[PDB]
Design a protein around this ligand. Structure first.
Ligand SMILES: O=C(O)[C@@H]1Cc2ccccc2N1
Length: 147
């Protein structure tokens, strides 16, 4: 039927069908379109108190809760989707990963190098697509596949 990870769902507020990807946590109204050794991704990481290392270049001690981190991620996705802010701008300013200094770019990578939920989401994205919240031991990520 649909490309890997994608399913149909019904909107509770509007009753209109939409599409959801259970690997990337992406969701959208439009029906999704139509695997490589390597993909290239950027990300925006929001850490929280249960991250494996609750510290980053932004904050020596990261104290926010998992739920507060998810709300921040949700807000950044809204601003990216509305076009009020670019992904790169938000990653440079607010990602708790040192890759913030390269607009969130992680370069190319293959399967077997990254944490599994990040890897799985990265490889299920098509070039140009963006994930919803992706949960790892580091924190919560927004992932943008660039190649
Ligand atoms: O560790 C991993 O594979 C994923 C990708 C990544 C990059 C930077 C910081 C945390 C993080 N989680």
């Amino acid at each position: 039927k649909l490309p890997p990870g994608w399913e149909k769902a019904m909107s509770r507020s509007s009753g209109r069908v939409y599409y959801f990807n259970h690997i990337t946590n992406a969701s959208q109204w439009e029906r999704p379109s139509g695997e490589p050794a390597r993909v290239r991704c950027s990300h925006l990481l929001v850490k929280h108190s249960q991250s494996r290392r609750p510290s980053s270049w932004r904050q020596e001690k990261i104290t926010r809760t998992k739920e507060e981190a998810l709300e921040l991620i949700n807000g950044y996705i809204q601003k990216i989707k509305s076009g009020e802010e670019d992904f790169e701008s938000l990653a440079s300013q607010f990602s708790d990963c040192s890759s913030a200094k390269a607009r969130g770019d992680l370069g190319a990578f293959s399967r077997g190098q990254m944490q599994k939920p990040f890897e799985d989401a990265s490889f299920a994205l098509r070039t140009g697509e963006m994930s919803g919240p992706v949960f790892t031991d580091s924190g919560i990520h927004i992932i943008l596949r660039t190649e």
